[PDB]
């Protein structure tokens, strides 16, 4: 089929983030685990400017995102103080049923 459009297709969901996790921090985590992150978007408010607690990460493609999502899906996240777990999920985690 035709190329079409693609937004959050080759990206992964990353929640349970700290109130001090910026594009830099997030990028550091992945990079530390030996993962070359493409981009990172921190969902923050307009008035409070506080990060909802999750950010989106882009990658080369879905294929890579998968193998790269299962390699950290459950592993300990570096830097996290004191310490947290790599919280990753499919960008299409809309609803408990879907899975």
> What domains can you pick out in the chain, each with its CATH number?
8-92 (3.30.70.330)
In Å, how far are 1, 20, 89, 97 from 52, measured between CA atoms?
A: 37, 11, 16, 24
The count of other CB atoms within 10 Å of the CB of residue 55 is 22
89-94: list long-range contacts, CB under 8 Å, 24+ apart.
89/12, 89/13, 89/15, 90/12, 90/13, 91/8, 91/9, 91/11, 91/12, 91/13, 91/56, 93/13
Residue partners of 51: CB distance under 8 A and separation at least 6: 17, 19, 21, 42, 43, 44
The count of other CB atoms within 10 Å of the CB of residue 57 is 26
d(CA 79, CA 58): 20
Locate all alpha helices (DSSP H) within 1-99, ordered by sequence: 23-32, 62-70
Q: How was this structure determined?
A: NMR
- Give the bridge partners for 85, in sequence order: 76
């Amino acid at each position: 089929g035709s190329s079409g459009s693609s937004g959050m297709a080759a990206s992964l969901w990353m929640g349970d983030l700290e109130p001090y996790m910026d594009e830099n921090f997030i990028s550091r985590a992945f990079a530390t685990m030996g993962e070359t992150v493409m981009s990172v978007k921190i969902i923050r408010n307009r008035l409070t400017g506080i990060p909802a607690g999750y950010c989106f990460v882009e990658f080369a493609d879905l294929a890579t995102a998968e193998k790269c999502l299962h390699k950290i899906n459950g592993k300990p996240l570096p830097g996290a103080t004191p310490a947290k777990r790599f919280k990753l999920n499919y960008a299409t985690y809309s609803g408990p049923s879907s899975g």
